Amino acid sequence: LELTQSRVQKIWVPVDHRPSLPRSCGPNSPTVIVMVGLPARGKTYISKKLTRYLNWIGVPTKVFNVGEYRREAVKQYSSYNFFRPDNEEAMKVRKQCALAALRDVKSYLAKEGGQIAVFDATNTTRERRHMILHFAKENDFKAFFIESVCDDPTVVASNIMEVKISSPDYKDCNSAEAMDDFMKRISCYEASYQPLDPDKCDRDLSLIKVIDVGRRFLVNRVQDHIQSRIVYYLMNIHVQPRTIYLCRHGENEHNLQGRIGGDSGLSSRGKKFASALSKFVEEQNLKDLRVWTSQLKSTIQTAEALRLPYEQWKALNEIDAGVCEELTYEEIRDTYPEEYALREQDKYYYRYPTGESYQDLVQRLEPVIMELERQENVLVICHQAVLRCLLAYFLDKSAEEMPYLKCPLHTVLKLTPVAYGCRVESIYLNVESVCTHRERSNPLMRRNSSS
Ligand SMILES: Nc1ncnc2c1ncn2[C@@H]1O[C@H](COP(=O)(O)OP(=O)(O)O)[C@@H](O)[C@H]1O
Ligand SMILES: O=C(O)CN(CCN(CC(=O)O)CC(=O)O)CC(=O)O
Numbered sequence: 001l002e003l004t005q006s007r008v009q010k011i012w013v014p015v016d017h018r019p020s021l022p023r024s025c026g027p028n029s030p031t032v033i034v035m036v037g038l039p040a041r042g043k044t045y046i047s048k049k050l051t052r053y054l055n056w057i058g059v060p061t062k063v064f065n066v067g068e069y070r071r072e073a074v075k076q077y078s079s080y081n082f083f084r085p086d087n088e089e090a091m092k093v094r095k096q097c098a099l100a101a102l103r104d105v106k107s108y109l110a111k112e113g114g115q116i117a118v119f120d121a122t123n124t125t126r127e128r129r130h131m132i133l134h135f136a137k138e139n140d141f142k143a144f145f146i147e148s149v150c151d152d153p154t155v156v157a158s159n160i161m162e163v164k165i166s167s168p169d170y171k172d173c174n175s176a177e178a179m180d181d182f183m184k185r186i187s188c189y190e191a192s193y194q195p196l197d198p199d200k201c202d203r204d205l206s207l208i209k210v211i212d213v214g215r216r217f218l219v220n221r222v223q224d225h226i227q228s229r230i231v232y233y234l235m236n237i238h239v240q241p242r243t244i245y246l247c248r249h250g251e252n253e254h255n256l257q258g259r260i261g262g263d264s265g266l267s268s269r270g271k272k273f274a275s276a277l278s279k280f281v282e283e284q285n286l287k288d289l290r291v292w293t294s295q296l297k298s299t300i301q302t303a304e305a306l307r308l309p310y311e312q313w314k315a316l317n318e319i320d321a322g323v324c325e326e327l328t329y330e331e332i333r334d335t336y337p338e339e340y341a342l343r344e345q346d347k348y349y350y351r352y353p354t355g356e357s358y359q360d361l362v363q364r365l366e367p368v369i370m371e372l373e374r375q376e377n378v379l380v381i382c383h384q385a386v387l388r389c390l391l392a393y394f395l396d397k398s399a400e401e402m403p404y405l406k407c408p409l410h411t412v413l414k415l416t417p418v419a420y421g422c423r424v425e426s427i428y429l430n431v432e433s434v435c436t437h438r439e440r441s442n443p444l445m446r447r448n449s450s451s
């Protein structure tokens with residue numbers, strides 16, 4: 001009824017004329033994701049990637065890798081002898097690392113505003129899982145288990161070569177000895193390994209068992225929307241290497257005039273870029289390459305130069321500047337001084353009047369990210385703000401830094417899988433253009449001076 005519209009996010013909220021003594025309160029039960037499985041089964045890979053995705057869509061998540069606690073408490077690894085089930089002391093130290101991590105999990109979800117905590121450890125015995133469940137119950141946390149099962153020696157071997165040998169645990173080993181040591185290490189866990197049994201012993205646990213690197217899944221009792229989204233995500237990512245290229249439309253006429261938004265066409269240089277891009281793509285020599293564009297002219301003209309089939313996504317259209325569309329930043333500053341200042345102070349959350357914020361962009365791009373995960377080689381031709389958002393996802397950049405990432409015209413960002421993340425290579429196609437990047441740029445108000 002009598003509402004007021006927040007200046008930054010433009011959200012209508014009830015006016016709350018605070019009383020003489022305003023009161024606060026202080027400030028959707030948080031969840032503990034329990035990874036399960038033998039070493040070299042992708043638990044850490046899954047932990048980091050899912051966390052990258054959840055934080056990007058706005059769900060504060062953090063990984064608690066018990067291995068890092070262990071490496072912190074023991075300083076330098078020597079051999080798998082540390083992981084022998086008959087190693088009483090180590091068993092004690094490992095359990096203490098687990099409890100220390102849970103201690104931090106508790107502090108994260110109950111005191112730091114965290115919503116999802118990913119507990120990354122083997123948790124291969126029913127007893128250890130029972131303990132974690134107890135910890136969850138007593139703290140009012142939900143528990144969701146993600147078990148990765150892989151009986152393909154080729155996959156295990158490959159996993160060891162990709163992230164284990166170059167691990168700091170093996171800084172003093174060559175590949176062969178590191179490989180040999182890790183296999184012995186894995187065998188240490190095999191005797192006591194009790195996989196999740198949803199059809200019996202674990203009938204009441206909320207879980208997903210990932211099998212054969214995502215070929216088959218067993219899902220038991222999803223409890224809410226967050227677990228729902230987690231399962232959807234897990235079931236649509238794969239590990240086969242591929243390449244994602246990101247770039248903007250070639251320079252357009254509005255760029256030349258310093259005007260934002262709009263649907264202008266390529267400038268003469270933008271067209272030169274489009275040709276260069278075709279030459280670039282050709283040289284990458286990719287068997288298959290999917291091309292995606294927004295539904296705005298400039299990206300489409302750019303794709304036409306490639307002589308390849310392309311698909312238009314309205315979701316890739318540039319951020320909508322609302323009433324500031326078609327204006328120059330100078331005209332925005334002069335015509336809407338307050339809006340200009342508000343955006344400068346909170347570029348990620350700020351929403352243009354009748355328009356969007358980077359936050360809105362992210363929500364809009366969720367489907368693009370999910371489909372990108374399903375794809376192989378793909379080239380996305382988009383716009384500045386959109387590219388920053390997609391780049392933030394791939395490079396795990398925060399919301400605060402997202403609106404300022406540098407994504408220049410006529411430059412391809414080549415992303416490739418490396419270990420637990422993505423490597424980025426910048427390739428400028430040598431065609432001039434303007435620069436659309438803009439960095440982050442009192443006295444009288446104090447005396448003297450659900451599921
Ligand atoms: N569902 C999966 N099954 C088997 N390997 C996987 C899976 N998902 C990812 N990987 C691979 O596992 C590696 C990362 O393993 P890591 O996460 O360190 O294993 P762990 O944490 O279980 O010891 C990567 O090479 C990745 O390709
Ligand atoms: O150490 C890591 O980076 C992740 N670990 C998970 C935790 N480590 C703890 C440790 O290495 O001390 C294994 C475990 O939980 O027993 C992967 C694995 O070996 O399963």
Ligand SMILES: O=P(O)(O)OC[C@H]1O[C@](O)(CO)[C@@H](O)[C@@H]1O
Pocket residue numbers: 255259260261262318319321383384385403436438
């Ligand atoms: O988020 P930023 O830095 O204001 O840039 C947004 C602008 O970038 C552009 O793509 C111009 O380069 C505009 O169409 C859009 O409004």
